Design a protein around this nucleic acid. Sequence first.
RNA 1: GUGGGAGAGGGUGGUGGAAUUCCCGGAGUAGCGGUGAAAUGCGCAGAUACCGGGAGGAACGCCGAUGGCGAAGGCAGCCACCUGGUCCACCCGUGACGCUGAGGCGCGAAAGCGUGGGGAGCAAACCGGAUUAGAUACCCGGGUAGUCCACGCCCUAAACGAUGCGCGCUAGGUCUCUGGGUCUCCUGGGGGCCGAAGCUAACGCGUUAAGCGCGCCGCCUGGGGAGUACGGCCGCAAGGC
Lengths: 119, 101, 88, 73
Amino acid sequence: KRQVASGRAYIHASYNNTIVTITDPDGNPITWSSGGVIGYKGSRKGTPYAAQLAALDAAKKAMAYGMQSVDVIVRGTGAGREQAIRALQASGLQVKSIVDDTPVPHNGCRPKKKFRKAS
Amino acid sequence: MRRYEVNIVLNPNLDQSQLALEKEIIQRALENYGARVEKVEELGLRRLAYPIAKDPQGYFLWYQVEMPEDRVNDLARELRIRDNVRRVMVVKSQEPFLANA
Amino acid sequence: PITKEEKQKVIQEFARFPGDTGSTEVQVALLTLRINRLSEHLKVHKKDHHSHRGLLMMVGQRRRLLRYLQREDPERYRALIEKLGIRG
Amino acid sequence: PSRKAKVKATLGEFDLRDYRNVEVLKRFLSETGKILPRRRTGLSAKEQRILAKTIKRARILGLLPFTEKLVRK
RNA sequence: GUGGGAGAGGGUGGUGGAAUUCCCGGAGUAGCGGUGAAAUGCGCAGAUACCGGGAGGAACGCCGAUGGCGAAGGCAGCCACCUGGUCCACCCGUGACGCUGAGGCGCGAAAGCGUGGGGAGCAAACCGGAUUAGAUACCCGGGUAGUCCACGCCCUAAACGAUGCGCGCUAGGUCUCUGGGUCUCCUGGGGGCCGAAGCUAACGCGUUAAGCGCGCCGCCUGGGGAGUACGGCCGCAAGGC
Ligand SMILES: [K+]
Ligand SMILES: [K+]
Ligand SMILES: [Mg+2]
Ligand SMILES: [Mg+2]
Ligand SMILES: [Mg+2]
Ligand SMILES: [Mg+2]
Ligand SMILES: [Mg+2]
Ligand SMILES: [Mg+2]
Ligand SMILES: [Mg+2]
Ligand SMILES: [Mg+2]
Ligand SMILES: [Mg+2]
Ligand SMILES: [Mg+2]
Ligand SMILES: [Mg+2]
Ligand SMILES: [Mg+2]
Ligand SMILES: [Mg+2]
Ligand SMILES: [Mg+2]
Ligand SMILES: [Mg+2]
Ligand SMILES: [Mg+2]
Ligand SMILES: [Mg+2]
Ligand SMILES: [Mg+2]
Ligand SMILES: [Mg+2]
Ligand SMILES: [Mg+2]
Ligand SMILES: [Mg+2]
Ligand SMILES: [Mg+2]
Ligand SMILES: [Mg+2]
Ligand SMILES: [Mg+2]
Ligand SMILES: [Mg+2]
Ligand SMILES: [Mg+2]
Ligand SMILES: [Mg+2]
Ligand SMILES: [Mg+2]
């Protein structure tokens, strides 16, 4: 119960899952979705197809709020990052722009051993 | 005594009176710490590349000075005591290094 | 630090004649200058070892020059020590 | 890699030690706030070395960005 | 000596932005996370994803290099102060004042020790999930010491160029960092690569010698036993020599 009609779409994509939030111009979310929000449970959440389904689900739930045009912002590198963006463009939502906001430290914190040989 | 440059970034939302006040305080601290002002440049309000103290702009002051280096750090500390002073950067002066010469 | 008027002052103090820069007396004088300043610097900053090496080197140089002067003309040597007030 | 050319080639005779000059310095940063490598800057060893310093200074002052957001991903 | 230079060389105090964690608030709801696949775990006391604010600690992206500095260990945000070494130009001063260096003294990565702080992230030990014939381990979730600071110890290493320091001599070529110059190029100091002569068992080294020489120091004398035993010295201990 809003009637936003213009907003932001955050695609946060890791290798294990893709979660898509859709928010008002001030960044407060409205609806969100993910691999697990659709049927998938295990590794399949990190699929590009699951990313497509997530983006589309999120966008559908968004257009339920009377959403029309969004600004897409992408965080993270993973399979189905781009596929999430593609699903979003094809969604019927008008995509005004795409941005990579993916956070990186300037040598801040010690990574886990998996992520070592880095800082 | 050595030649320095004092960069000062202030609150753009200051009115005339309070601004004149802050500048007065800067002058007084500068003099009290033994600095002589060779040249001063007031750039005014400028767009920052990122918010400083929540605010997208800043008020720029530039003072080329000479002073007793053993007293330099303190001066900067003094300059930062004020609340309305957002940035202070004191720099050892240098001869201009040109490319395309 | 050591500025130019200071250094020139000590140079013209220990010179053996006008124009003398690098005679043994003047060198021992300059080394005493730098050593004193540096040891004062190391009175605080006890944890700066990289400078302390410098101190060792300067002391070494001074002691070798003095050893030379003692060997050559004992009078100029006694004079130098009495003037600067070193050793002990 | 570096397919246009030489940031240095298009520019006037400028002070590399002026951190207060935004106009000239902004040309040495990429789309993101990252400082351009030598291929792009066209500068020399100590030239580049000085530029890095003055840029970092300008960043501290608030005149130049530390980092930016990439567009059209 | 005078006049210039480059530099993550060292010490003290400041200070900047990104990120992580935690806390407060807003919005939002059914999962998140994690793997080869999973489970533990976390989430309806509302998590994850998004926004704003706050606290705190630690490390400094791009620049960044096949780069620079240091005797070595090692040194990287920015600012100032204090300070070491070094290179060049002038050819000004001293007049062999030199080299090496057993002992001694000091410095000495990481881990470790003592006292007191600090503790975000990481993480020996430990506690769980899995995998496996079994899993102690690899993989996943937690996690204490520790990692950080001060003061005091410890003295080790693939402390590596596996190449002691100094000086003189013996083709060049090519890239590079930093000075000077009559600045296409010559000249000086570093860092690389290909190679003359020569050396080497070979690999390779080759004006940054592993070549030709001189000086001085340290060292080696088949493998295992064994860097063990005994003794001594050092250490709070671990332990070291
Ligand atoms: K050895
Ligand atoms: K030149
Ligand atoms: Mg998954
Ligand atoms: Mg569209
Ligand atoms: Mg303030
Ligand atoms: Mg330094
Ligand atoms: Mg923060
Ligand atoms: Mg909350
Ligand atoms: Mg449960
Ligand atoms: Mg409920
Ligand atoms: Mg805390
Ligand atoms: Mg090393
Ligand atoms: Mg110096
Ligand atoms: Mg002469
Ligand atoms: Mg003579
Ligand atoms: Mg020696
Ligand atoms: Mg002794
Ligand atoms: Mg140690
Ligand atoms: Mg330690
Ligand atoms: Mg301890
Ligand atoms: Mg952990
Ligand atoms: Mg673990
Ligand atoms: Mg060569
Ligand atoms: Mg060379
Ligand atoms: Mg050379
Ligand atoms: Mg041959
Ligand atoms: Mg060769
Ligand atoms: Mg035998
Ligand atoms: Mg042993
Ligand atoms: Mg051993």
